[PDB]
Design a protein around this ligand. Sequence first.
Ligand code: 39A
Length: 215
Amino acid sequence: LDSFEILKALKSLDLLKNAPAWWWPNALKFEALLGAVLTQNTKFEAVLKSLENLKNAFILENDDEINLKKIAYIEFSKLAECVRPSGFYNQKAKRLIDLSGNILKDFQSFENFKQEVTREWLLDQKGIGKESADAILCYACAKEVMVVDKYSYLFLKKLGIEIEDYDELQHFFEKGVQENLNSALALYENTISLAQLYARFHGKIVEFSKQKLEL
Ligand SMILES: Cn1cnc2c(N)nc[n+](C)c21
C-alpha cells in the first residue's frame, strides 16, 4: 500500500469526470489563491459564495494584477463583509489584506509571486497554515506540491495507515508518485505535469471523501 496504488484505484473511479483540468475552479489564477485562504475551516461551497460576492461587487474582475492591488488596498470592513459566507470573516479579511500587501511588497506582482513564492514565505504570513499555503503553491502557482488535509488523514487511516503530522502525510502522498513517476504520468499519457497530477490527486481524495465512497 503506497500512494501510487491509491492513485490508480482512485483514478479508476472517475471522480473527476465533471471537474475542470486542475480540479480547483479557476486554478492558476488569483481567485485560486483567494479560495485557498477562504476555504480554511469551512466548506468550499461557502467559499464559492464569498467569491461570487467579490465578483458581484466588482472587487474581483478579469485582471489578476488589478485584483491583487484591489485586495491589498480594500477597506478592511468592506472585505470582511463580502467574505462572510466562508466564516471567520474578520480574520480572513485581515489575512488576505496583509497577504496581498506583502505579495506586492516582496514580489511586486502576482505574476512574479507565482514564480518566486516559497512555502516558508507563505507560512510567515500571519494566519496562513500549511494546508492553505500548499493549496496556493499547487493550485494558484503550479508548484509540485500535494495538498493534504483532514480528508486525506481519514482516508488513509481507513486504509490502515495513520499519519497525523501534516508534513509526513504529505510526504507519504508525494513519495508514492515520485517513486513511480513514469507510471503515474502514463495513467494520463504524458499530457499533464506532476503539479497538475497532484492537483487532481488531492481533488480525487476530496471528492471520494465528500461522496462517502469505499475503495
Ligand atoms: C478546496 N477545493 C477546491 N475545489 C474544491 C471542490 N471542487 N470541492 C471541495 N473543495 C474543498 C474544493
